[PDB]
């Protein structure tokens, strides 16, 4: 469980990093932004999921 | 200090508070990159 908890938390930090560089150039650039609307939506959906599944798993570890 | 599971991210926590000042620097980086309008 703790290895799984670290694994999920590490992916969250990574996917936040990938998100924080990713969406500004997703909205901003003018030669594709409208095709990236699904990428940012699924990405943000997975982000809030990953946050809350790591969150509830806290009480099952510590 | 921090629960023992997150203890691995003790360096990550130490580098959090100086992230605010960088925004103000980035705004000057941005302005010089577009050649100051």
């Amino acid at each position: 469980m703790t290895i799984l908890f670290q694994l999920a938390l590490a992916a969250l930090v990574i996917l936040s990093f990938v998100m924080v560089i990713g969406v500004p150039v997703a909205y901003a650039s003018p030669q594709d932004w409208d095709r990236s609307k699904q990428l940012i939506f699924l990405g943000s959906g997975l982000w809030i999921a990953l946050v809350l599944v790591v969150g509830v798993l806290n009480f099952f570890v510590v | 200090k921090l629960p023992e599971a997150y203890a691995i991210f003790d360096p990550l926590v130490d580098v959090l508070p100086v992230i605010p000042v960088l925004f103000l620097a980035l705004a000057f980086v941005w302005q010089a990159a577009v050649g100051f309008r």
Binding site: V13, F17, V20, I21, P24, V25, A28, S29, P30, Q31 | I8, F9, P11, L12, V15, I19, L22, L26, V29, W30, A33, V34
Partner: peptide, 28 residues
Amino acid sequence: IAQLTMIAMIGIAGPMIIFLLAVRRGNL
């Protein structure tokens, strides 16, 4: 094992966003 890897990454995180918009020319 290194944790200095993200302190490396997190300082270049800012200008890389602008660098690419200046590669993909538009809206700096």
